[PDB]
C-alpha cells in the first residue's frame, strides 16, 4: 500500500 508521489525520486 501507500503510493508514492513519484516513482523515480
Amino acid at each position, epitope marked *: *500500500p*501507500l*503510493q*508514492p*508521489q*513519484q*516513482p*523515480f*525520486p
Partner: antibody
Amino acid sequence: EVQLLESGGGLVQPGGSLRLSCAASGFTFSTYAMSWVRQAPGKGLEWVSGISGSGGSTYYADSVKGRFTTSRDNSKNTLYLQMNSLRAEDTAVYYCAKFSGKDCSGTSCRDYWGQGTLVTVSS
Amino acid sequence: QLVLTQSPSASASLGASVRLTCTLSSGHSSYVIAWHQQQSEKGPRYLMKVNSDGSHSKGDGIPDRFSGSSSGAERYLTISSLQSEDEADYYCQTWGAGILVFGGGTKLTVLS
C-alpha cells in the same frame, strides 16, 4: 507543447550494443523524472527504466537490469538508453515517456510519449 | 504485488457507450492510474488520470466524450457516442516505489 523525439533505433546482432536518444523540449527537462517503455511485436506496453530529474537515481525492470543503463544530459535536454548484450527478445518499439505521477496540479499532471523507435536484435 | 487487471477485449455499437475497467490488486485501492490509448500501429496517447475521488487530468485535445471514474479498487474509462477512431487498445498504467506497472490492455472493437 511538450515534445519527445527519439532516435537511434536500428538493427543489431545478438550480443551487440545500441544507444537510444530522446530529445525533449517544451518544459524544464531537469525538473522531471523520465522513463523508457517498450512494446514487443503483438504484445502490450512494458516498463523498461526510470531516471530521476537529477540523474542520481536509476530504476530498471528485472528483464533488463544489468544490460540496459539509462542516463541523461540536462543541458542538451536529452534522455538516453544504453543497451549492451542485446538479445533477440529485446526486439521491440522503444518509447521514451514523461510520467508526472501525482503532486502536480492541472495540465502539469499530464503524461507525454515519444513517437517510438524500432530496435531489432537478429542474426 | 502491484498488478493492474484488464480484460483483453471489448466491443460496443457505433454511436453507443462503453465503459472499460481497470482493477487494482488488493492493498492498492488508493492508487492513481492513467489511461493511455494506442491505435493499431501507432504510439500511445495519454488520456487522463483517475484517482479514488474520480477526477481527471485530460491530455490536450481529448474530447469530452472521454471521461473517467473510480469506485474502490476499480478504475473506469467511459467513451460515449463511439466513433470508428475510438477503436484502439486501452492501457491503464500506475506506479509504485521505483516501478511502473501496466495492465495488459483492452482492445475495443466498434461494431456495425
